[PDB]
């Protein structure tokens, strides 16, 4: 699977470390393009980083800090487009991967494939084992029209570096080896030539091409300046509709495509909103509704009527810079059937800002969210009031799409709680992202949950630690109920089943439906039990009703 997604956790220490590595190994294991900030921080030394080994592109910045590994195998790293940049400057920054007072610490960049740095500068400081980082002609990397050609570099180490490779032309090298040799492609090139494969002219790369080539064509390119149109690094993916130049009726253009980040695709991928105007997003353009389309797609179409009112979460609109839910915003969410944005409950949710006479959130207030079905963002909990034994004010929460993810990576997080079981019964889709569930001392009925069906993509996985030991969990007796199919439940009893063994009577699982004996004869429908019409006489044993409405019964 080519495309993964960045993190966005900066230099901030990983909440659950014992998980953290296994977070990285999931995010990118299989990954080629990385729409956004490749962040590899805090990693200690016993740490096999063999999943990055596939990554070409990186749209974001590339942050490397406070690690300890002597080496990070980012060896195939073609181009880093600095779309967003670290500290709004550096499309790459390697910081303090030295030791917290022979030794550990990052030693060689080995970036022997990094041709282009489309935007932003470079910042490589305080890595007391790092060599040959000055020894790079950084000016060949930066794009031509890179007007962010700024660089700061530390050379101080406690270690004395070795000579480069003999097999290296200049003293220039990424690493001591001979394949680790800086291979230039802008300065050592022929004329106007942005990118080329040798001093010769014929060695020039295409203009649409962008990080060198193996030929004169766009279909010979090492990267793309605008969009990989199915192998032909272009300027513009063919739009969805063409014009007669004269009249101007535009019947659709069959061989048109969709700009996916840096790509040119026919069908915007899973969690992504295909558009009228031809993009893929996770926010529809203004004056658009997010429909649910004549297929299965999400889609972003217009608004005839001034569009109908819509709920917003944290990191969206007036709530954008808000971080937690408090008493002073909790009411906005009443009535909300689908929250655009995200909700998060930090421990300041539950003791308010006395600095601002903001009352602490009371556990009766949460009883707003039972009306909520679909979160388009993340869900993050770290305090939940001591009482409420379960996350069930979201009992009706059906899907979490995670087109925002907490700390970059996590669509559903749960830490330092004290609930005794989950309770999201209705939760079927975990659209994207990883679920992190750690340090809830009393948390059982996690194992009991079949995550593998919530999830939507292979890179996805539930990671968890420091919870309540799932062997001590049948130790007090806790386990799914008999009416919960395939052994799968979200908590005790047949409310928290995942699929009912036989039928549903509302929110409770049952063995069968009163077609024959129960206090009112019912009729079965989508394995739901529903009542017939009260005036359809009770039959002394046999079938009574035959449907919900007034007629289809007896008398």
């Amino acid at each position, epitope marked *: 699977t080519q495309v993964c997604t960045g993190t966005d956790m900066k230099l901030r220490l990983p909440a659950s470390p014992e998980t953290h590595l296994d977070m990285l190994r999931h995010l990118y294991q299989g990954c080629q393009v990385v729409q956004g900030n490749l962040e590899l921080t805090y990693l200690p030394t016993n740490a096999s980083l063999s999943f990055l080994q596939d990554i070409q592109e990186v749209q974001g910045y590339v942050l490397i800090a406070h690690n300890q590994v002597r080496q990070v195998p980012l060896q195939r790293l073609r181009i880093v487009r600095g779309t967003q940049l670290f500290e709004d400057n550096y499309a790459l920054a390697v910081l303090d991967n030295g030791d917290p007072l022979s030794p550990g610490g990052l030693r060689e960049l080995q970036l022997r494939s990094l041709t282009e740095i489309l935007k932003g500068g470079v910042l490589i400081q305080r890595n007391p084992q790092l060599c040959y980082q000055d020894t790079i002609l950084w000016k060949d990397i930066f794009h031509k029209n890179n007007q962010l050609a700024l660089t700061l570099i530390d050379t101080n180490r406690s270690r004395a570096c070795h000579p480069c490779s003999p097999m290296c032309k200049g003293s220039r090298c990424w690493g001591e080896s001979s394949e680790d040799c800086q291979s230039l492609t802008r300065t050592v090139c022929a004329g106007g030539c942005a990118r080329c494969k040798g001093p010769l002219p014929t060695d020039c790369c295409h203009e649409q091409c962008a990080a060198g080539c193996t030929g004169p064509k766009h279909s010979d390119c090492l990267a793309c300046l605008h969009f990989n149109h199915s192998g032909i690094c272009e300027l513009h993916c063919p739009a969805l509709v063409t014009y007669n130049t004269d009249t101007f009726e535009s019947m659709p253009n069959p061989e048109g495509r969709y700009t996916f980040g840096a790509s040119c695709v026919t069908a915007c991928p899973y969690n992504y909103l295909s558009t009228d105007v031809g993009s893929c997003t996770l926010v529809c353009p203004l004056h658009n509704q997010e429909v649910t389309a004549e297929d299965g797609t999400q889609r972003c179409e217009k608004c005839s009527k001034p569009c109908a009112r819509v709920c917003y979460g944290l990191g969206m609109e007036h709530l954008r810079e808000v971080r937690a839910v408090t008493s002073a915003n909790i009411q906005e969410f009443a009535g909300c059937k689908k929250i655009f944005g995200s909700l998060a409950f930090l421990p300041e949710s539950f003791d308010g800002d*006395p600095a601002s006479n903001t009352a602490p959130l009371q556990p009766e207030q949460l009883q707003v969210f039972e009306t909520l079905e679909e979160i388009t963002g993340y869900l993050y909990i770290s305090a939940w009031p001591d009482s409420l034994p379960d996350l069930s004010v979201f009992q009706n929460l059906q899907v979490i799409r995670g087109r925002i993810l907490h700390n970059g990576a996590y669509s559903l997080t749960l830490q330092g709680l004290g609930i005794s079981w989950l309770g999201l019964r209705s939760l079927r889709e975990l659209g994207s992202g990883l679920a992190l569930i750690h340090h809830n001392t009393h948390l059982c009925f996690v194992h009991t949950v079949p995550w593998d069906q919530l999830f939507r993509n292979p890179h996805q996985a539930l990671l968890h630690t420091a919870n309540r030991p799932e062997d001590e969990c049948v130790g007090e007796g806790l386990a799914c109920h008999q009416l919960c199919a395939r052994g799968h439940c979200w908590g005790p009893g047949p409310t928290q089943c995942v699929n009912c063994s036989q039928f549903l009577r509302g929110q409770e699982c049952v063995e069968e439906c009163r077609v024959l004996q129960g206090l009112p004869r019912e009729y079965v429908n989508a394995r739901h039990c529903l009542p017939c019409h009260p005036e359809c006489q009770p039959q002394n044993g046999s079938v009574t009703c035959f449907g919900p409405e007034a007629d289809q019964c007896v008398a």
Partner: antibody, heavy 118, light 111 residues
Framework: EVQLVQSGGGLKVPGGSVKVSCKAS????????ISWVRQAPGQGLEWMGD????????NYAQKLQGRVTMTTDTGTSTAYMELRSLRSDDAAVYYC???????????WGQGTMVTVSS | QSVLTQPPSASGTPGQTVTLSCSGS????????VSWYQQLPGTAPKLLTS???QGPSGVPDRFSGSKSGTSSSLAISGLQSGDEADYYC???????????FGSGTFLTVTV
């Protein structure tokens, strides 16, 4: 074990300053506040000010305004009691504390030794 | 917003059921701002009850506070041998909010 550790425990001449340290560990520093409180000998408690870890905002009490600056240090995780224009009155013990929950102050640095006399 | 502790000193022998007070100077929250502390001689004060009737973790069940109108009341089941300390409360309502002049108990081993 979550912790707060305090330093600066010294002596001072009236009309000087001190900036007490408070290195907080073993918990996401940014997602709780941090507060300071003082305790002269024989007497009792008295609250200094607030300090949302996440975003700086403050609430230095009345008896001390303009004489106090409190500062977070996210990068390194420390809170600082920058106290000014002190005197004999201002000789006390300056504890630092968070407020997990659910509302008061739970974890407590040992407090520091601050005495003024010329 | 403010309070007063009576007494600044109550004494106690083992097995006994104790009481300490605090008078909230306004209809505080609401309910649940108040919290009591334990102060060992020459060491850091630590929280005992908060939300009035709720122990934290690492503070024992012979501890349990309460409230009534604008007054709070800490309670000890049977007193023990380590409970030599001064006890403070707080109405953590608005800001700025106040502490108290301190109810401090001691272990009466034959006056």
């Amino acid at each position: 074990e979550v912790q707060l550790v305090q330093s600066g425990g010294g002596l001072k001449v009236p009309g000087g300053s001190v900036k007490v340290s408070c290195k907080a560990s073993s918990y996401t520093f940014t997602s709780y506040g941090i507060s300071w409180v003082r305790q002269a000998p024989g007497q009792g408690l008295e609250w200094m000010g607030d300090v949302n870890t996440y975003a700086g905002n403050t609430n230095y009490a009345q008896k001390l305004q303009g004489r106090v600056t409190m500062t977070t240090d996210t990068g390194t995780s420390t809170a600082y009691m920058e106290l000014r224009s002190l005197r004999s009155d201002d000789a006390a013990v300056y504890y630092c504390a968070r407020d997990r929950g659910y509302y008061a102050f739970d974890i407590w640095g040992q407090g520091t030794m601050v005495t003024v006399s010329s | 917003q403010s309070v007063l502790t009576q007494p600044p000193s109550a004494s106690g022998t083992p097995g006994q059921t104790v009481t300490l007070s605090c008078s909230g100077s306004r209809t505080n929250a609401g309910r649940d701002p108040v919290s009591w502390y334990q102060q060992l001689p020459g060491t850091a004060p630590k929280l005992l009850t908060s939300t009035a009737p709720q122990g934290p973790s690492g503070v024992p069940d012979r501890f349990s506070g309460s409230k009534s109108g604008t007054s709070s009341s800490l309670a000890i089941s049977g007193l023990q041998s380590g409970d030599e300390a001064d006890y403070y409360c707080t109405v953590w309502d608005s800001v700025p909010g106040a502490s108290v002049f301190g109810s401090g108990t001691f272990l009466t081993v034959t006056v």
